[PDB]
Amino acid sequence: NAQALNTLVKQLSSKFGAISSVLNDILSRLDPPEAEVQIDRLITGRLQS
């Protein structure tokens, strides 16, 4: 149980192909039209995890 929870909580620091692993960085550096492209990859990776 500890190993599974640790892996699940660790998987939040992966870019999954985007430019950063922090949402606030993307939301404070790009226009709304270009934010979705980066956000989608993170969403898919976290859903898979």
């Binding site: 430019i19 404070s28 550096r29 790009l30 226009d31 270009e34």
Partner: protein, 50 residues
């Protein structure tokens, strides 16, 4: 130093303001580790090559 990009807008009526990694409108609300500026003069038809 304090980097104010507002003085750049009124300096000249620029006709090309391409920004790749940052949206220009948010430039006043960010902090950077280091900044590099390069200056040169070229002909008009070569502007697209940059």
């Amino acid at each position: 130093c304090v980097a104010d990009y507002s003085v750049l807008y009124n300096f000249a009526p620029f006709f090309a303001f391409k920004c790749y990694g940052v949206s220009p409108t948010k430039l006043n609300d960010l902090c950077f580790t280091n900044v590099y500026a390069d200056s040169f003069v070229i002909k008009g038809n070569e502007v697209s090559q940059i």
